[PDB]
Design a protein around this ligand. Sequence first.
Ligand SMILES: [Zn+2]
Ligand SMILES: [Zn+2]
Ligand SMILES: [Zn+2]
Lengths: 212, 432, 57, 100, 127, 734, 270, 18
Amino acid sequence: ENERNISRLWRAFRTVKEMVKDRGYFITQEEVELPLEDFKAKYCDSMGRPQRKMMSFQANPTEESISKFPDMGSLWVEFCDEPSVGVKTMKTFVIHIQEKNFQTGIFVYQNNITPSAMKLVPSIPPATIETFNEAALVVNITHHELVPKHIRLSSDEKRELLKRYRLKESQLPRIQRADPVALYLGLKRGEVVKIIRKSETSGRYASYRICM
Amino acid sequence: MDISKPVGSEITSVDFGILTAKEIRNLSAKQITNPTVLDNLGHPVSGGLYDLALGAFLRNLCSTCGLDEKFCPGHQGHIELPVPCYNPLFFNQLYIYLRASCLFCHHFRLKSVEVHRYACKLRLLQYGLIDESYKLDEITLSSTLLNELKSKRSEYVDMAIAKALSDGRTTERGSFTATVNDERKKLVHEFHKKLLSRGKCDNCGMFSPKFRKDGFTKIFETALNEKQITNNRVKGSTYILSTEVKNILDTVFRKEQCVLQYVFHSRPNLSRKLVKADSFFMDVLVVPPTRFRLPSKLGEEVHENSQNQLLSKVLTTSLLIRDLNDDLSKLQKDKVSLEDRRVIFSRLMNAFVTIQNDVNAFIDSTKAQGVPIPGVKQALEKKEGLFRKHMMGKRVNYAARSVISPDPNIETNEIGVPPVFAVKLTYPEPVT
Amino acid sequence: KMQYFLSTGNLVSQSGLDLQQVSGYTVVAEKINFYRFISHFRMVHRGSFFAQLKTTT
Amino acid sequence: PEDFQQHEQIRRKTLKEKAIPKDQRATTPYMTKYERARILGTRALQISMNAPVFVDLEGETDPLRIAMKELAEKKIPLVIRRYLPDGSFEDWSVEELIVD
Amino acid sequence: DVDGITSNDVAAVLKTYGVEAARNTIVNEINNVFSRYAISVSFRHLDLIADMMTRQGTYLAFNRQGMETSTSSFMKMSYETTCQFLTKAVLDNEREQLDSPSARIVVGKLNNVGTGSFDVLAKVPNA
Amino acid sequence: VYRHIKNRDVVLMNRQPTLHKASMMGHKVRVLPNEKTLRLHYANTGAYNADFDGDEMNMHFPQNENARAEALNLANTDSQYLTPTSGSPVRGLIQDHISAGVWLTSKDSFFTREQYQQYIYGCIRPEDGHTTRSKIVTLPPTIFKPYPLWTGKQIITTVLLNVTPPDMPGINLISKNKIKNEYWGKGSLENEVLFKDGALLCGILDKSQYGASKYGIVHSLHEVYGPEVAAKVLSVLGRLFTNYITATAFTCGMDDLRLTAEGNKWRTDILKTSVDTGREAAAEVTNLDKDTPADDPELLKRLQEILRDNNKSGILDAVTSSKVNAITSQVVSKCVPDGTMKKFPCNSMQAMALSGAKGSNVNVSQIMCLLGQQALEGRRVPVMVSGKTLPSFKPYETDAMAGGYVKGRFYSGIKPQEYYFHCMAGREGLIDTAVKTSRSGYLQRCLTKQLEGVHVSYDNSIRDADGTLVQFMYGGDAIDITKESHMTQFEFCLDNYYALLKKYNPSALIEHLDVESALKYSKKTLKYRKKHSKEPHYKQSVKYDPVLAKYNPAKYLGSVSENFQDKLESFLDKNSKGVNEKKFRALMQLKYMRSLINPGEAVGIIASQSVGEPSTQMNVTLGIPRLREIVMTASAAIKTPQMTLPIWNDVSDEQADTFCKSISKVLLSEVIDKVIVTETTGARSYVIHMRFFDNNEYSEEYDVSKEELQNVISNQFIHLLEAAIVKEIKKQKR
Amino acid sequence: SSRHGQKGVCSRKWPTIDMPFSETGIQPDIIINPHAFPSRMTIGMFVESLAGKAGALHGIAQDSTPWIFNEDDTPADYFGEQLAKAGYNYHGNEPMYSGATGEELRADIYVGVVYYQRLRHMVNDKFQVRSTGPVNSLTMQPVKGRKRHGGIRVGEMERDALIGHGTSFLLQDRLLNSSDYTQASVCRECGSILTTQQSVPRIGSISTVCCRRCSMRFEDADSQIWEDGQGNKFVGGNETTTVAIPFVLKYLDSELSAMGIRLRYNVEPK
Amino acid sequence: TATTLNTPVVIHATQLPQ
RNA sequence: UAAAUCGAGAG
DNA sequence: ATACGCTCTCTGCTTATCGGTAG
DNA sequence: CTACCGATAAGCAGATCTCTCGATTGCGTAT
Ligand SMILES: [Zn+2]
Ligand SMILES: [Zn+2]
Ligand SMILES: [Zn+2]
C-alpha cells in the first residue's frame, strides 16, 4: 500500500516538473520522463519511504523566456514532508524564499494548510507564493482531451491584441484567477492567456482570456 | 412619424437618481390638500386631485399653460406629507444601513481603517482599475500607524488613478464594463455583509441597541441589555419614530460621506453632490399630471382613477394627523391634562403608522395590509405591466389581420390582398 | 343571492363547502346547435382547480 | 462664449481622434447587405423630397427604383460611416465599395 | 485512461478542469440533446451560446441571477423583477448609454444592429 | 398623398407564434378583386408553419422608404430560402405538386406538340418577365417517328432553359430522389437524378428535388444562379404542376387501400403466430422455463407481483413491446408493396407516401396492415388494481391484444378494446401536443433577452451590445450558416465551374484586394501543421497562428479556416480532373471570401432562435428538461450526473466487469437478508440480530468479504444506530 | 367540415364549367384534396362516401354504427356490391373529364356523397384592418379589440424576429414610428421630459416653451420673463428642444417620479 | 413657424461681441 | 372610451 | 330613500443557529 | 474561556404567443 503512495508522489512530481517546464523555466525531458524505479533509487531510502526534502528543487528561465519575459526570476519548488502546514513551516518557507531572493516559490503540501499559515501567502510582494495540493497534481489537467492549449502572452503581444481589436482590458472574456489552469500557468491578474481551441467547424483558432 | 418634420436633438443617455424634496416643491404647479376630487355639479374643486393647475380636464382650460385638453401636456403636483415616511423601494437598504451603526460616535460599528480600505477599493473600481484594487490590499506593514496607513493607501490610489488617466486608458468619466460591475457588486456585497457582523463600535467600544423590522411600516428596536449597558458606563420591543431613524441616518451619512460617495456611485461623481439620508425618505409625494389619472367612462358608468383613490386616502390621513398635531399644539402653550396628552399621542402614533401604510399601498400593493388596488410598482412589474406590454410590444397602425387562403398564380414572393385592405391601408407619397 | 350564484358561478359561503374551487360553477347553455346544447347536460368536470396544474397524470 | 468654444474644440478634437485615416481602414472592401439596404432607403427618401437626381428616369415613378438605378451606376452621393465598438470610425463612399 | 474522462456534469468539470473544458462540455451536452431527436443545429450557434454562458470565467445561466451584472439597466428591468433592478440602478446612480436593443426601444432610438450599425453622410459639392 | 396600397408596395407578413425570424417576411403586394382573405403561395407555408385551417396572420404596412428597402432586401422572402438554424432550405412545393411531378417526370409521360407547348406557355408567360429570351425556345421532340412526341423530363428541361439566364451554362447536378429503383421495375435507374448542361436526362423530380430539402435541383439553382432565379423557378414549377394537375387529375380511393388475396393470406398467417407472443414474453420475465400455460398458478402469482411494482412491470411492458413490434415489422415487410392490390405508381396512397408529398410508411402500414402496439408514455396500456387491462379481459391475461396490441387496420376497422386503447394513445398524444408548446416559450425568451445584443462587429469579431467581447470570429471561421451549404460540395462546384465563375468573377475583384500575402501565410502554416500534428495537442507549440487570426478573411484572398483548406487539399489530391486545380482553388477561395457573415448580423438573436425553435419538435436526463438544466438554471446540482471513463486496451472485459464493482457504492442494507429485534423490557433489552445473505453470495455480487462487513458494522453501523436512538429519545422527552 | 374531422376553409368558388364533370353529367359541389387522408387516416370518410353514393342510388339509408362490420365482411365489399348492382363500379370511382381542357382525366375519380357541416367560423367575424383610429388615453397607442377599430399587437416575439433580420428601420416603424411616436420638448439643461410647459403671452407676444425646474420665480430673482395662467412670473428655463420619443416614455417618467425616481435625459446637441 | 426647417436647433456665441 | 374576473372559443 | 368602510412549486437567496478553530 | 469562520437546517421570492366573443361588477348600518 505504501507503493501506492510512492507512485502517487512520483506522478505528482512528474506533473510538477511538467507545470514548471510549461511555465517557461528550463527543465529537460530527462527530468520529466523519469522511470519509477529511477525515481525510487533517487528519492527513496533503504526503507523505501520517500523523503520530500530532497524533492524540492530550483528552476531558471530559459533563453527564450528571458527574451520574451525579461522580468522572470528563479523559481523554488518545495515539498512538505510534514503531514500538515503550520505557522512555523509557512513563515520559514517565506524566509527561505526571501534570503535566496527567489522571484517565485510554489508550495506543495500533503493534507492541508492551517488558516494561520494561509495568512502568510500574500505577505511578501512582489515575490508571489502559490499553493498546490499533492492530490490535485496526480494527473496533469492540461493533458486532458477537453482542455485546450493555454499560452500566456507577453506584454508586447498584449499591446498588439488590445490594439488590433481596440479593447479595454476588461472587455475581453475573463478567466477566473482560481480556476485550475490559471493556477497551473501561474497567472497574475492583468495578463492574457491565448487559447488555441480546436473547433468542430473551423479547426484551430485562437481565443484570448484575461485573468481578473 | 412624418419624414417632413425632422428632429434636431437626440437623447444619448439616461441616468437614474433620487428626486429630492427641494426640487419637486419648485417644479410643482400646485399642491393638493382636500381629499375630495370634484365638488357638486361635477366641477373639479380647486386644490383637489383634479385641479386646473394639474392639466386641462373635461373641457376646462388648464390653469397653468392655458391650453385645452388636446394640447395640454399636463403638470405635476405634490403632497406635503406631515412626517418623513420610508420609501418602500429603498426600505431594505435603509434597514441594512440603520443596523451596523454606532449611535454614539455616528460611525459604522466596523473600524474606520477597514471602511477606508473598502472606500479606496470602490473608488479604484470606479475607473475600472480592478488590477490596482487587489494591489491595494498589499499595504499592511496602535492609533498613529493607522493614520499613516490610510495616507499611504490614499496616495497609492491617487497615483494609480492619475497614471491610468494619463496612460491613454481612461477619461474623466471612468471605465464601466460588465466585469468591473461584477467586481463592484461582489465587493459591495462583502462590505454590507461585513457591516452586519459586528459586536460593538471600534472607535468608541459601546454596544448599540439591536433593531428588528417586524414588517414594513414599522421598525422595532430592542433595548440594550444589562451587561451591555455596563460597558457604556465603563467607557465614559421599543417603537422608534420615522424622524428618529431619519436623524440617525442623516448623522451617519454626514459623518461617512467620504465612504458613501463610492457606494452610491458606479462612476466618478463629477457633480460632487453629497449623498444625503433624505434621499431614502419621501417627505413629499409627487402626484402625476391629471392626464394620467383620468376617470373611466362607459355611457353613464363613470369611475374615478385608482391612483386618485390612493392619493385621497393619503390626503385624508394627512389631514387627520395635522388635526392631531394642532390639538397637541394648543395644549403645548397651556397643558391641562396629561391623560388627554396620552390618548392624543396614541392616536398620533396610530396616524403615523396609518399614513406610512397608505404610502406603501400607494407605491407597492404587496407591501400594504388590511384584490387590493395595484400600486405604481404593480403597474410595471410583470407581464401586462408597462415594460412588457407597452414598450417591448405595442399595438400598431396601418396593420391588418385576416384568415389566409391558398393561391397559386401568385409569384411566391407576393401576398394577395383583399380589396377592403387595399381601400383602407394607405401610404404617404410626397408629390414630386 | 341564488340568482347571483347562477349568473356569476361564484360560490359565496361563509363556511366553505367540501368542494375546492370557488368560482366557475355554472356554464351558459350556448344552444349553438342541438349537439352543442345537448352536450352541456352530459359533460362532467373534474374541477377547475385541476385546470391550473402542471402534471398530466 | 468662451466655455462654448472650449467645448467645441474638445468635441472636435475627440472626433478627430476617432476618425481612422483613409489609408488605415481594415474593414471589408465589399458593401454589406445592411449597408446597401440603408443606402437605397436613404437615397429614396432624399429623392422623394425633390433631391437632385443624377440618373435618367426611364418612365419610373418609384423613388426606390430611382435609388436602385443610381446605385447600379454608382452615382449616389452618400458616405457610409462604419463604426467600431471603441467608437472609432471609417468613411467609405459608395463608389469605393463594391456590391456583392 | 484518466486523460480522457469526460463528464455530463458541466460544473464539476469547471471546478477541476477550468473554464475552457467546461465550455467544451457545455457545447457537447447542449449538442447531444439534439442528437437524440436527430435535429440539425450548427455548432456555430452552440459555440456562441457556450461562450456567452462562460464569459466571466464562471458558469452563468440565462435568468435574472445570470444577468445580474450588465451595463444596461433597461434590459434587466424589462426582463423581470423590474423594481429590484430599478432600485439597484438608482442607488448605484447608474448611467446607461442606451446600447442594448431593449434600451433603445424604451427611449425610441434606431437600433445598433444591422442597418443601424453605421451612419450615412451626404457629399455636398459646395463648401 | 395618402394613396392606397398598390402592386409595387411591400408588406410585412407575420404569423404567431414567431418562433424563428423566417416566420415574419416581406411580400410584394398584389391586390385581388374578390374576397376578404390574405392569399398566400404554398411555398410560404413551410416557414410560417401555416395551414389553411382557418389560420390567420398579420399584414403590416411600412410607411417610409427606409422600412420599404428593408422588407424588399433584408426581410425579403427571396432572401429567406435557407433557414439560419442549419442552412437547410425551408421553401418548396408541398403536397399536390410533388405527386404531380412524380407523374410528369415519369417515363410514361409523352406529350404531343400542342400539349407540350401549352404546358410550357402555361407557366413561362413572356410578358410578366417570366422568361429571359423574349421568345419561348423549345426543344426537338424525343421521338421523331411515327409522330412527334416530347417527354415530361423535356418539359422540365425547357422550363429551366427558359427561366435560366442566357450567356451562362446550364446546371449540372447528380442527385437522388425518395423512390427506390425497385418501384419502377427491373433495370430502372430513375432513383438517380441527373441534370446535364441544364437538361433533365434521368431520375424523377420529387420532394427531395423541389421542396425544403438540401442538394436538390432548386437548392443547386439557388446556389448557382442566385436567389431571385430560384424563386422564379419555384413559381414556374408551381404553375406548371398546377396546370398539369388540372388536365391530369390525381385521386385516392378505397381501391388503393386494399390487399390482394395472397396479401391478406400472408397477413393472417403471420398474425396467427402472435397468439403466443404475450405468454412467451411473460414467461421470459417471470423466469418460468417455457410453454407454461397462461393459467399456471406460479405464473399468475409472479405476474401479480410484477404488476404491483412500477419497475418490474416497466420491463414486462418493454420486453413484450419488442416482440409485438417485431411481429408488426414482419407483417409490414411481407404485406407491402407485395400484397397490395394496386401498385405504385397507380396506387396513389403509396405514390404520395413514397414521394414525400404527404404521409409516411407507418401511416400506410396502419391503414393497410395493422395499427400495432399502442404505447402509453413508453409503456403499454395501464392496468387496474385487479390486474385487468379492461373489463373484458381476465386478470393478468397473457395476451398481446390485452396489453394494447391492435391487429386491426383502419381499412377493416378495429375492435372495441382496440378502439379504447387507440383512444388512450390519441388522448396522450393530444395532451403531449398541448403541453409541449407551453414548455418551450420560456427557454427562447430567456435566450433572446440576453443574446439580443450580441452581433458581428466590423472587426469581424462578435461582441455584446455594450462592447464586451464574446468571440473573436463567428464560429472560428466567420462563415455564414446560410451560405456554407455548397462550400464543401467540391464536385458540384467543379462541374459548374463556369457558372460560378460568371457570378463570383475574379476579373472585377482585383483592384480592391490583397491576393498573395494570405496565400503565402496559409502555405507556411499548412507546411508546419503537416510537419507537426502527430504528437498530443498540449505538446504542439504554436509557432504559426491560423491565418484567420492575422489576416481579415473579408479582405485577404486565401485567408480561410484550416478545416476548409485541409478538405480542399484532400479533394484536389484524390481526383485529378478545361479547369485546372489552380483556377479551381482560386474560385473556391473567392467563394469562401463571399461566404462570410456580414458585420451587423444579429448573430445572438439568430442563435437563440435556432436553439429555441428546434426545441419545439422535442437513465440520464434527456430532452427539453436537460436544456432547462444547462441554459436556464446552470445547475451545479445536475439531476442525474454521469461520468465517462476510457479503457486501456490492456485490460479485459473480465477485469472491466469487476472494476465497476470495486467503485460502485455498497450500502449495508444491500447484504442484510433480515433484521430481528427482540425487545424485552424488565432496563430495556434488545437483541438486534442481523441475518445476512450467504458469504459466497455477497462476497461475489459485491466483492465484500466478512472482515470488511464486520468492521463496517463495528465502526459505522453501531455509531449511527446509537446516535439515532439518542436523538429520538431526546426528541421524545416531551 | 365533415363528420370525420376534415375541417377546412373555402378557397375559391369554382365556376361550374371549370369543375370536372362525370360520365353521368354531374359535377361535385365539394373538392377535398386526396393529400388530406394519408396522414390523417380518415378511412371512415372513404367508406362514408361509398355508402352515401350507394344509398342515394338505391334510395335507402345505411346504418354506420361502429363494430357492425367485421374483418371478414369489410364495408368496402358490402357497399361495392351495392354500387355494382346499380351499374357503378365496385370501388366507387367514376370517369370524369376536366372542365378546362375537356379531355378525360388520367384515371377514374373517387366521388361519392358525404355529409358536410358548415361551421360557425366565418370571415366577416375575423377580418380587421386599421389605418388610424382611437388611441389609449395614457399611452397614446392603438386600442385593443376588433370591434373598437383597434390595432394588432407586435409583441416581443415579433420584436426579436425583426431584430434578427437586421431590419432596424422596420423595428422603428412598427414599435415607434407608427404606434405612439411624438415630439416632446425636453429641457436641455435639466434633462427632464415632463417638467417643461408652454407660456401664456401678452397680447402681441409669442408663446414659447419653458421649464419649471430650471427657472427662477421672478420675486426671488425683459427677454427672459415668462408667465403662466396663474400669473406667477418666472425668469429663465428657456433652454429646451424637441426630441422624438414614444409617449409611453413620458408615462413611465411620470410613474417613476411618483416613486421618487428622477430620469435625466442628456440630449446630444448642447 | 418655429420649426427645425426655419430656426436653428442650437445657436451659440463663439467670441465676445466686437 | 375605460378595468378586472369568470366563461366560451381559433390557430 | 341613502353615504362610507372593508385545501399536493423550482430555482436560488437570505437568516438562525451550531460546531470547530485559534487569540 | 472567548471571539472569528464557516456549515448547514429553516424560511422566503418570483416564475414557470397572438386573436375573437359574452356577462357582472357588494354589502350594512344610520339617519
Ligand atoms: Zn396644462
Ligand atoms: Zn462609535
Ligand atoms: Zn429644466
